[PDB]
Design a protein around this nucleic acid. Structure first.
Ligand SMILES: [Mg+2]
Ligand SMILES: [Mg+2]
Ligand SMILES: [Mg+2]
Ligand SMILES: [Mg+2]
Ligand SMILES: [Mg+2]
Ligand SMILES: [Mg+2]
Ligand SMILES: [Mg+2]
Ligand SMILES: [Mg+2]
Ligand SMILES: [Mg+2]
Ligand SMILES: [Mg+2]
Ligand SMILES: [Mg+2]
Ligand SMILES: [Mg+2]
Ligand SMILES: [Mg+2]
Ligand SMILES: [Mg+2]
Ligand SMILES: [Mg+2]
Ligand SMILES: [Mg+2]
Ligand SMILES: [Mg+2]
Ligand SMILES: [Mg+2]
Ligand SMILES: [Mg+2]
Ligand SMILES: [Mg+2]
Ligand SMILES: [Mg+2]
Ligand SMILES: [Mg+2]
Ligand SMILES: [Mg+2]
Ligand SMILES: [Mg+2]
Ligand SMILES: [Mg+2]
Ligand SMILES: [Zn+2]
Ligand SMILES: [Zn+2]
Lengths: 81, 127, 100, 214, 25
RNA sequence: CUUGGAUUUACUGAAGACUAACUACUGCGAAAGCAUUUACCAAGGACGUUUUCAUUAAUCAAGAACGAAAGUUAGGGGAUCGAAGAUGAUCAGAUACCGUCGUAGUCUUAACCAUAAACUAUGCCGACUAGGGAUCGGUUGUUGUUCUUUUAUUGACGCAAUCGGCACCUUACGAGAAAUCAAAGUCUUUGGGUUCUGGGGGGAGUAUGGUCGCAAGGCUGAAACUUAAAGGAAUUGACGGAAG
């Protein structure tokens, strides 16, 4: 391809790129609002959390760290902020 | 029914052993080698000598009461070749054609799980 | 000059490979370089599979196979015609020969 | 000069009741004389007989049982279990390329103090929809499978007597349990107890042996 | 001659030179 | 070597090595190298990260660590192979190839040695230039698939992306003397950073001095003299105790 719009890449191909290989690098991680099953208290949890986060109300682990994204425990619902 | 021995056939590339024992292998019934059938060293392992060796074994087996045999064919094994010698195929066919009955057949070549150093040197035997 | 881009062996991303002895002459040859053939032969030749089946005391007894993996050095294999000299352009072809 | 076969006496080999076809076959020995009795020189003999013969079925053609004679009753030899092994051709037909081989062994004693080494073998299974050429398990998975083999052989041997274990080996109870227990680790095929070795035997109990012969 | 054997010959000849000079130290 | 029972057969035992098959254009390591199980000890790359510090970096005379095999010193082991040596053949001769024995050695612990076609014969760091399918490790989205267990939060497999690797196939924009090369390209349209090395063939890695080593030897290292080629890649032919 000799002629191509480098300043306006296709958003489809833009989403497949590595996070450092876009025009402006941008993280693919996010923050979530986590509902434990026991109660209803907003707890902000990083998507790629490295800590076994526990909510303040009840000492229940919300997520377990993995190689990539943290794994939410059963009965815990998240909503992306 | 039948009376089983064990035909332990050791077929190397220099000779052929046709050795019939009992089930335990502690009692030897007949042991005829291909070298007892020829007067040349070069064909002690010939298919022809193995067939003659097997026929003498079968005749000896019949007069003792052995009517069937199990086959345990082996090559030299160890650090040496694992393929059976040319006489092992003839001794097996001769036994079957001699009125002896055949049971299980197995290869029992000794095979190392590594091993000791094999003779010949690093560059092998140069011919 | 360089005859093969692979140097006649199969060592890439590796320092050293332990040797194997040629079946025929017991020469030390690196495991990746040795010409290896897997053979599954009938223990009884097809001529004798009939008369030996009649002498069997077992109805429907399957004759065991003979499994063996052979290692050859380059000299052992070339002499026994296991591999042959190929033309300069035909050397690159590394698919198994279309015989079976 | 003497024809040593005129002095041979034939004996019958009897398998334990754990097997079906207890008439294994015949052996011979020098006839009992004044210096040497035939009985004492005949016990301790080991017979290697295919399991398909002891059970009739051809499904056991690739396993062969070692029977050790340790009692003589007239012309009958009362044998006991001495070991288990695969035929050489069967083992060679299972070891293919483009798959992982995993092995384990453990030394364990039965309820009646029979010290055994039990060898387990298994291979990675290719899924029916699999496209890639090879079926390799990661070395961490193989360590987990190997750990699962060992604790099952230890459990299924130490909790039963040697006679009961013989009844377990014939239908591959241990092999079926290892395959089931490792399903969540990796799919496996051809899970077998490929060898059993007697290392040490307890003090001889003729009454215990006699109960295994009728 | 072969380079390896040419090298061995000189090493044996160097060895002699050292021993001969040592006589007078 | 064998009727003093060899070779062969079954059972039992002991020694040292070695880790077959699985084993691959697969993995790891700075390289040399590394392949039975488990435990322990301390490391490591890659990946993921909206964590942290902020130039701490690249390459490096001098100077260091490691460095196959063989070899040296002293203990221990010494199964097998096996320099030397001894022997039977072959031969005109073979103290060679081949056969049978065999000592150092091969293994290990404490130290030395510091060299290999130690090779990808291809320094390291950085950027860019072309298509394709595989594969190993991590991560991220998703199945007429098998299985947990009956399903999920099971695992395997399948399909997609991506980062890193080991490589491979096609083409030649381009390079090259060519063989060939995705780097050996972006080099007379000659300059991204930096270390090392070469200057016709021999004499010669020799002599001498120094230095390291117990030694073997290593590192550094000439000159006199001699010579018109030596050499690289490819072409045609001739020949081959190479194949078809
Ligand atoms: Mg030759
Ligand atoms: Mg050449
Ligand atoms: Mg190397
Ligand atoms: Mg691997
Ligand atoms: Mg690496
Ligand atoms: Mg330096
Ligand atoms: Mg060294
Ligand atoms: Mg010593
Ligand atoms: Mg020795
Ligand atoms: Mg001589
Ligand atoms: Mg000599
Ligand atoms: Mg020799
Ligand atoms: Mg020897
Ligand atoms: Mg030493
Ligand atoms: Mg050098
Ligand atoms: Mg190389
Ligand atoms: Mg170099
Ligand atoms: Mg450098
Ligand atoms: Mg680069
Ligand atoms: Mg992957
Ligand atoms: Mg050009
Ligand atoms: Mg190419
Ligand atoms: Mg390349
Ligand atoms: Mg010069
Ligand atoms: Mg040339
Ligand atoms: Zn909570
Ligand atoms: Zn060779």
């Amino acid at each position: 391809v000799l002629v191509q719009d480098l300043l306006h890449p296709s958003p489809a191909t833009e989403a497949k790129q590595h996070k450092l290989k876009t025009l402006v690098q941008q993280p693919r991680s996010f923050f979530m609002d986590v509902k434990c099953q026991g109660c209803l208290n907003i707890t902000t949890v990083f998507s790629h959390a490295q800590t076994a986060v526990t909510c303040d109300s009840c000492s229940t682990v919300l997520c377990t760290p993995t190689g990539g994204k943290a794994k939410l425990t059963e009965g815990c619902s998240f909503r992306r902020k | 029914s039948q009376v089983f021995g064990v035909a332990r056939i050791f077929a190397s590339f220099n000779d052929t052993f046709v050795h019939v024992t009992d089930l335990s292998g502690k009692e030897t019934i007949a042991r005829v080698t291909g070298g007892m059938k020829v007067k040349a060293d070069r064909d002690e392992s010939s298919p022809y000598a193995a067939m003659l060796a097997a026929q003498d074994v079968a005749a000896k087996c019949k007069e003792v009461g052995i009517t069937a045999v199990h086959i345990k064919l082996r090559a030299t094994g160890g650090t040496k070749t694992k393929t059976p010698g040319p006489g092992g195929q003839s001794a097996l066919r001769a036994l079957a054609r001699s009125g002896l009955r055949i049971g299980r057949i197995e290869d029992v070549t000794p095979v190392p799980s590594x091993s000791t150093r094999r003779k010949g040197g690093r560059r092998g035997r140069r011919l | 000059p360089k005859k093969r881009a692979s140097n006649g062996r199969n060592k890439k991303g590796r320092g050293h490979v332990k040797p194997v002895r040629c079946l025929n002459c017991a020469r030390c040859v690196p495991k990746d370089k040795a010409i290896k053939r897997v053979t599954i032969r009938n223990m009884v030749e097809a001529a004798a599979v009939r008369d030996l089946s009649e002498a069997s005391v077992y109805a429907e007894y399957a004759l065991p196979k003979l499994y063996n993996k052979l290692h050859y050095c380059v000299s052992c294999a070339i002499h026994a015609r296991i591999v042959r000299v190929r033309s300069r352009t035909d050397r690159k072809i590394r698919t198994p020969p279309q015989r079976k | 000069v003497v024809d040593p076969f005129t002095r041979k006496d034939w004996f019958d080999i009897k398998a334990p009741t754990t097997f079906e076809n207890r008439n294994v076959g015949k052996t011979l020995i020098n006839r009992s004389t004044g210096l040497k009795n035939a009985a004492d020189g005949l016990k301790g003999r080991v017979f290697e007989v295919c399991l398909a013969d002891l059970q009739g079925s051809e499904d056991h053609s690739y396993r062969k049982i070692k029977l050790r004679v340790d009692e003589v009753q007239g012309k009958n030899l009362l044998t006991n279990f001495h070991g288990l092994d695969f035929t050489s051709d069967k083992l060679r037909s299972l070891v293919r390329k483009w798959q992982s081989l995993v092995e384990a062994n453990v030394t364990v004693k039965t309820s009646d103090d029979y010290v055994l080494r039990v060898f387990a073998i298994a291979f990675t299974k290719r899924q029916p929809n699999q496209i890639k050429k090879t079926t390799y398990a990661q070395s961490s998975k193989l360590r987990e499978v190997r750990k699962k083999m060992i604790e099952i052989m230890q459990r299924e041997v130490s909790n039963c007597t040697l006679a009961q274990l013989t009844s377990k080996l014939i239908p591959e109870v241990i092999g079926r349990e290892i395959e089931k227990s490792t399903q969540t680790i990796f799919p496996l095929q051809n899970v077998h107890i490929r060898k059993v070795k007697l290392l040490k035997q307890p003090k001889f109990d003729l009454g215990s042996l006699l109960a295994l012969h009728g | 001659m072969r380079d390896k054997w040419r090298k061995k010959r000189v090493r044996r000849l160097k060895r002699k030179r050292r021993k001969v000079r040592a006589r007078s130290k």
